[PDB]
Amino acid sequence: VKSSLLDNMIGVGDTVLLEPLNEETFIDNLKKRFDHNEIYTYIGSVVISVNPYRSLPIYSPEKVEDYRNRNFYELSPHIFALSDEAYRSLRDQDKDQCILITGESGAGKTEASKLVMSYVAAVCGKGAEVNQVKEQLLQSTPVLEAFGNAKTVRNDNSSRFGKYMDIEFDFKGDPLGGVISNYLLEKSRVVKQPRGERNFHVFYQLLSGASEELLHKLKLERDFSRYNYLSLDSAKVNGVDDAANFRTVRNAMQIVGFSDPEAESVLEVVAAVL
């Protein structure tokens, strides 16, 4: 079976018709649908995604094919119906579609982007050519986490640039490729960290998860208090630990295509700016 707004309504799925309307009857709605673990909540063509901070199981390929060609008003509110509506307007209307994922840091924008793009490469129906495109984008995600995201006081993995992952189809529906594009990389975080934050954590990965010969040839030192670019009062962060995340990122760089002199050169430039 399925969760349906038709029979046995749960809260309201779309909040546009929710009356009485204030801040309190809307936070009560999000608390109520967060109680029943239905995190997605429409405002029509706009999808609210509350972070469950745990594996909600409704992301299976049976959910993918289950939501394929389903409108906004047949199913429960879920991101695959908006992603599938934009795939319908891409495929049938033959015009470009984009999905703008906003919200606070640590709310799960990057994860929701991975789930959107995973759905898009799933319901395209051309699963042989689009798989390595999606896989290099997803395996390039933690790299850009390391080089582009840092720990603000609120989050621990705060998004500090505008990531933008494309998937590129022919008008006959043939996947050509995909172009990833940065926007608004915060440059001044490299040189100053405001008293509760830390730098882009590839410096902590390079000074923590790296071998001693790699510390020697990059001329670095493991003490965090040596470097002016590098805070000590906010260096240690739990959860996302200054740990073997470095070899996760470097292995991901091996997945994307970086050779060992190439990634060695990249880490050497990171040691030069450090």
Binding site: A86, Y87, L90, D94, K95, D96, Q97, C98, I99, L100, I101, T102, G103, E104, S105, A107, K109, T110, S113, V116, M117, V120, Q132, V133, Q136, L137, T152, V153, R154, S158, S159, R160, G162, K163, Y164, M165, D166, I167, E168, F169, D170, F171, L176, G177, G178, V179, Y183, L184, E186, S188, R189, P194, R195, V256, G257
Partner: protein
């Protein structure tokens, strides 16, 4: 590595992983640029989506002009103006 080789007229589906309003207790130049590109981002909602609603709604013969919207061109004019902006006086 993944490039549209033999480039033709193509169509794109995109995903923008962009922040939300980084409103911190001690804001700085960075959160200023963050809130600013949020202002341009709401301008690309209020321009694209609301004005295609309006050309659609009026074009399909229904008699509306919906009530009001707070346009963000005043805030863009506050920041990105080449003479009276905030970024221009920083330049």
């Amino acid at each position: 590595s993944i490039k549209a080789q033999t480039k033709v007229r193509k169509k794109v589906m995109g995903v923008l992983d962009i922040y939300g309003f980084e409103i911190f207790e001690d804001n700085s130049f960075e959160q200023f640029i963050i809130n600013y590109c949020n202002e341009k981002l709401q301008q690309i909602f209020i321009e694209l989506t609301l004005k295609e609603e309006q050309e659609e709604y009026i074009r399909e013969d229904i008699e509306w002009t919906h009530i009001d919207y707070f346009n963000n061109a005043i805030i863009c004019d506050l920041i990105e103006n080449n003479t009276n902006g905030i970024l221009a006086m920083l330049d």
